[PDB]
Amino acid sequence: RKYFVAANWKCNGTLESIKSLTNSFNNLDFDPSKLDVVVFPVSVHYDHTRKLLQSKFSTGIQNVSKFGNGSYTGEVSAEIAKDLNIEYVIIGHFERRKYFHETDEDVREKLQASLKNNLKAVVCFGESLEQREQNKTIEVITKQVKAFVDLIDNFDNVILVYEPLWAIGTGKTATPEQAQLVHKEIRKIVKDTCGEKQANQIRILYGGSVNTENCSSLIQQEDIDGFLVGNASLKESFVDIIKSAM
Amino acid sequence: RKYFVAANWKCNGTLESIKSLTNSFNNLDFDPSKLDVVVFPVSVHYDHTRKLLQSKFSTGIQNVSKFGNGSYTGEVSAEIAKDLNIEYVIIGHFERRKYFHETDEDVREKLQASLKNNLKAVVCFGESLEQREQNKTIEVITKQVKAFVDLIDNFDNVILVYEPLWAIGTGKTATPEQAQLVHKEIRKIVKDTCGEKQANQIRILYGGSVNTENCSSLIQQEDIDGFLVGNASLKESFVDIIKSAM
Numbered sequence: 001r002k003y004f005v006a007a008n009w010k011c012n013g014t015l016e017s018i019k020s021l022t023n024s025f026n027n028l029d030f031d032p033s034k035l036d037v038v039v040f041p042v043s044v045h046y047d048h049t050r051k052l053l054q055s056k057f058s059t060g061i062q063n064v065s066k067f068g069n070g071s072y073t074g075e076v077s078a079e080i081a082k083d084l085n086i087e088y089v090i091i092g093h094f095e096r097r098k099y100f101h102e103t104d105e106d107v108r109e110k111l112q113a114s115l116k117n118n119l120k121a122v123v124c125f126g127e128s129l130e131q132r133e134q135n136k137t138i139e140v141i142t143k144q145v146k147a148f149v150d151l152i153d154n155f156d157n158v159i160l161v162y163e164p165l166w167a168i169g170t171g172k173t174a175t176p177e178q179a180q181l182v183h184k185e186i187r188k189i190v191k192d193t194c195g196e197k198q199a200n201q202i203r204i205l206y207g208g209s210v211n212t213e214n215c216s217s218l219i220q221q222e223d224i225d226g227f228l229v230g231n232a233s234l235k236e237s238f239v240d241i242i243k244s245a246m
Numbered sequence: 247r248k249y250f251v252a253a254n255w256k257c258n259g260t261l262e263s264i265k266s267l268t269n270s271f272n273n274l275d276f277d278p279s280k281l282d283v284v285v286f287p288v289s290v291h292y293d294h295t296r297k298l299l300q301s302k303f304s305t306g307i308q309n310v311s312k313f314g315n316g317s318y319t320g321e322v323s324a325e326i327a328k329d330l331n332i333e334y335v336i337i338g339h340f341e342r343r344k345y346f347h348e349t350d351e352d353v354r355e356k357l358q359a360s361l362k363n364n365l366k367a368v369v370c371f372g373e374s375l376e377q378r379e380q381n382k383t384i385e386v387i388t389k390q391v392k393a394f395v396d397l398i399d400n401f402d403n404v405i406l407v408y409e410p411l412w413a414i415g416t417g418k419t420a421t422p423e424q425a426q427l428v429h430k431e432i433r434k435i436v437k438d439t440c441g442e443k444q445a446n447q448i449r450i451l452y453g454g455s456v457n458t459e460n461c462s463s464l465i466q467q468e469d470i471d472g473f474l475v476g477n478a479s480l481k482e483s484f485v486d487i488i489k490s491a492m
């Protein structure tokens with residue numbers, strides 16, 4: 001599988017901080033045919049970020065609308081993303097499910113709209129602390145993945161992300177071994193639902209706390225194909241996280 | 247009061263269509279010291295739009311986060327807007343109340359963040375067909391305005407918009423006089439919750455259907471200080487709607 005390292009800048013940045021951060025990223029010599037490196041700035045920072053990053057970096061946005069063009073004040077359609085050659089979208093991030101009540105059906109509709117417009121999708125899911133302590137991790141992830149997985153018609157163009165919500169902001173820690181087991185089962189669902197080749201092709205990223213210290217322990221696991229990185233991707237040392245995939 | 251004519255492009259535009267439309271808008275000679283004219287493109291179109299419009303046109307975005315900077319994937323904070331010199335935000339548009347379940351409390355929180363970060367805000371509210379048919383227009387608008395109105399300190403920098411939801415896709419039609427009656431009531435609510443001077447300063451825009459054939463009849467009404475214009479603002483003839491306020 002081609003490894004995939006993504007920077008989710010979330011709701012952070014200034015014009016000047018992005019100028020310095022993108023300059024630092026550009027100093028890393030990597031081959032984009034060997035690994036994908038994608039930066040997801042805030043929507044209003046996209047043009048600045050895409051201009052400042054060298055062409056080896058891919059870019060995307062952090063959300064996309066389930067509606068197409070029309071009377072949807074504040075939304076960005078997949079059609080507008082296509083017209084701007086915004087290559088990737090994040091869908092289903094836990095912060096959208098938590099604060100903006102995004103549902104599995106919304107994730108399905110956004111994936112559908114994205115694929116129809118030739119956008120590549122980074123689709124997020126994962127179980128809560130209570131679900132995990134109830135031994136419901138596989139029931140929860142299965143339902144979340146089955147909400148959308150039958151739409152995938154090209155297994156390079158959809159990238160899955162496991163978010164261990166039980167170990168985000170809970171004072172709990174996931175280990176590489178724990179993450180590897182969930183990733184194996186995610187790949188088993190894709191297998192079940194879409195077939196063995198397709199399952200062995202798709203990228204499944206880890207979306208819990210990634211930093212320069214733990215990144216290699218994660219990506220060296222057999223079924224962990226890269227990361228969706230949050231706060232560590234706002235630092236110049238994010239290049240060392242990319243190096244773990246090189 | 248200075249009149250205020252705003253283009254809510256909603257979720258519409260291509261880079262090419264915006265190049266043509268902004269060129270047509272730039273041909274209109276008007277004096278921005280006498281009239282505010284504000285364009286609200288989609289977030290990922292903002293940079294292109296602001297570079298293409300002469301500064302006589304003010305610009306803004308169609309939504310803003312209720313949260314500040316941080317782990318809010320997909321949101322745009324008021325701090326980020328301010329660093330980009332985005333001048334205006336729309337808050338509380340009925341489409342966000344409808345499709346994204348934005349509440350009065352969300353509107354308040356977005357307004358507080360916006361004003362904290364020295365943005366100007368276009369704040370929308372209005373009653374449904376059922377509410378009007380139950381004779382609850384004033385009760386409903388009083389509650390919607392009182393959810394946020396105490397946050398306003400500079401009554402030039404918050405602009406209210408009445409959206410007659412009862413006449414939007416209902417087959418019902420608001421006459422300019424019916425609009426005027428609600429605008430006068432909104433101004434009375436501001437007078438009694440804030441003060442007389444405050445109420446006489448604040449702009450109250452009509453946010454129902456505005457086109458080249460009705461704009462003159464609306465802006466002549468005493469308590470109508472401009473418009474938040476939808477589909478008609480995607481047309482070159484929007485310049486004639488601007489002229490009606492000149």
Ligand SMILES: O=C(O)[C@H](CO)OP(=O)(O)O
Pocket residue numbers: 008168207208209210228229230231232
């Ligand atoms: O990966 C995301 O996009 C996350 C959600 O937590 O951020 P972090 O890497 O800091 O945990």
Ligand SMILES: O=[P-]([O-])[O-]
Pocket residue numbers: 454455456475476477478
């Ligand atoms: O966009 P509205 O005036 O129909």
